[PDB]
CSV table of C-alpha atoms in Angstrom, one decimal:
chain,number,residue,atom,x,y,z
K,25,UNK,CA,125.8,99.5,107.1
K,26,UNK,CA,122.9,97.3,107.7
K,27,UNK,CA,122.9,95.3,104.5
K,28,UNK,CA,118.9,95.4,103.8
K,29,UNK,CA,117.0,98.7,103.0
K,30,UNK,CA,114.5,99.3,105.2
K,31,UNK,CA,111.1,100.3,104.4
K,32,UNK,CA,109.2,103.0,106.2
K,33,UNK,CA,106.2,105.5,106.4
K,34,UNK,CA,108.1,108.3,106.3
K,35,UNK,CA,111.2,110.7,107.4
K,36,UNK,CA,110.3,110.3,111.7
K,37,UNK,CA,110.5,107.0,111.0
K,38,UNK,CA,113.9,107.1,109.2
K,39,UNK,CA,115.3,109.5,111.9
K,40,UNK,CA,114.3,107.6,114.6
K,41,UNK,CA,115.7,104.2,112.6
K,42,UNK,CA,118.9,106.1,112.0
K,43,UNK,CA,119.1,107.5,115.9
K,44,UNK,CA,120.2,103.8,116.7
K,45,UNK,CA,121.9,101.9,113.2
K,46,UNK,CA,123.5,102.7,110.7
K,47,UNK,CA,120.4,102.0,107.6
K,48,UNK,CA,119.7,102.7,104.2
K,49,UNK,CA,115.7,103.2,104.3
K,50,UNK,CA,112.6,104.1,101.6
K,51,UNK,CA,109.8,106.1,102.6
K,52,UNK,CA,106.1,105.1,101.3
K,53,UNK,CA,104.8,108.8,101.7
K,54,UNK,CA,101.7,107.2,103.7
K,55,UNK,CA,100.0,104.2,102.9
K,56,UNK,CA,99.6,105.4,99.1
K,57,UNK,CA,102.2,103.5,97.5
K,58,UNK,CA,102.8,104.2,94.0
K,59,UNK,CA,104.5,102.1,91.7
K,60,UNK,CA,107.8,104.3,91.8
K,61,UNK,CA,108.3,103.6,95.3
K,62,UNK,CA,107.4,99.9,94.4
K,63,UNK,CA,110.3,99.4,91.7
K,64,UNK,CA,112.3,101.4,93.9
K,65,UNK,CA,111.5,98.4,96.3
K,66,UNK,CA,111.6,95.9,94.2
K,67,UNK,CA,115.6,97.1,92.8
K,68,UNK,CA,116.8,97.2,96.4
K,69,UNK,CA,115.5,93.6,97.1
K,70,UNK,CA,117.5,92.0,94.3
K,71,UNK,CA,120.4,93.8,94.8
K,72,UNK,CA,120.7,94.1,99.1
K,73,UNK,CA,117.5,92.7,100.0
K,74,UNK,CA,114.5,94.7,101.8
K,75,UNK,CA,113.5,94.9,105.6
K,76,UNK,CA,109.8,95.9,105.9
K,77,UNK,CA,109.2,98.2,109.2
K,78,UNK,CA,106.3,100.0,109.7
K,79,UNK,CA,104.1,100.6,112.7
K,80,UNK,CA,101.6,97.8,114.1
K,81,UNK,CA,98.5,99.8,113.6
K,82,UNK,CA,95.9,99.6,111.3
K,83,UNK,CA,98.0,101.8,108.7
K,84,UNK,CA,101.1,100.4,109.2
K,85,UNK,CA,99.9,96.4,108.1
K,86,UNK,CA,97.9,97.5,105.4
K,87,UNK,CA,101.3,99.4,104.5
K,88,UNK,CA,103.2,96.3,104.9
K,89,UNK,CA,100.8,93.7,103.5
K,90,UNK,CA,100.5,96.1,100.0
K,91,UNK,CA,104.3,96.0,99.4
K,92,UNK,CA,105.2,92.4,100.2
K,93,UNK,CA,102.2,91.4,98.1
K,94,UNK,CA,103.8,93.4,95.5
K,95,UNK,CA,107.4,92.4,96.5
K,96,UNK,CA,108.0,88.8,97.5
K,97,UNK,CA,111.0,87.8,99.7
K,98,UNK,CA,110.9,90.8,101.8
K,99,UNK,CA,111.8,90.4,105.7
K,100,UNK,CA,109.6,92.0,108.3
K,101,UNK,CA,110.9,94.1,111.4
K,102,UNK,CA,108.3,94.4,114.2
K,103,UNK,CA,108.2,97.0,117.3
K,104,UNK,CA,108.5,94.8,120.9
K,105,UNK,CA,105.5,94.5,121.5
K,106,UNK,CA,105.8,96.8,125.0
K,107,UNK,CA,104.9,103.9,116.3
K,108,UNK,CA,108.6,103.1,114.8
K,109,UNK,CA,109.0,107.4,114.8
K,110,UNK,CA,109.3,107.3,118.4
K,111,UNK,CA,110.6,103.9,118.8
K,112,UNK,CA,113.7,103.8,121.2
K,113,UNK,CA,117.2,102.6,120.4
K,114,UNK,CA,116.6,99.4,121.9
K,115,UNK,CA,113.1,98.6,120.2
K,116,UNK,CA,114.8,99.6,117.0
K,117,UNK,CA,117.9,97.3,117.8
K,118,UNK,CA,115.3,94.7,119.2
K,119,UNK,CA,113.1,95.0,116.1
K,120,UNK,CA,116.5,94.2,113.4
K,121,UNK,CA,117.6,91.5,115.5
K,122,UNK,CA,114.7,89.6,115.2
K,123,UNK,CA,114.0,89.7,112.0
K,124,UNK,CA,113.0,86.0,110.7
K,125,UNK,CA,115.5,84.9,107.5
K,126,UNK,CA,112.9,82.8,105.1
């Protein structure tokens, strides 16, 4: 339903995203991204656009900063600042909501 696919770590992450919207999402299997999970990326972003959403920690940036470098023109979801697999309803809510449109 959300128009964007979502990108994620992995499955906890897409549970807990789909525990509170409706979301198409892509898992990165880790911070290893390989290039299938790039042009996987890349397809969804031309077609519907891509919402980048992984944890603030150490792992999570370097996850994020390795596929928009790759991908330009994806958005960025953050967690309020008060990891997205046990994010609640309301963060995850909070977190699509604010997503900046560039």
């Amino acid at each position: 339903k959300i128009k964007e696919v979502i990108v994620v770590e992995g499955k906890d992450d897409t549970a807990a995203i789909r525990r509170a919207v409706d979301a198409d999402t892509i898992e990165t299997n880790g911070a290893a991204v390989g290039a299938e999970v790039i042009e996987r990326i890349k397809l969804a972003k031309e077609r519907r656009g891509v919402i980048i959403f992984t944890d603030p920690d150490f792992p999570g940036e370097k996850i994020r900063r390795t596929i928009a470098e790759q991908v330009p023109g994806c958005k960025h979801a953050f967690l309020p600042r008060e990891g997205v697999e046990h994010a609640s309803p309301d963060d995850i809510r909070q977190a699509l909501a604010n997503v900046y449109e560039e």
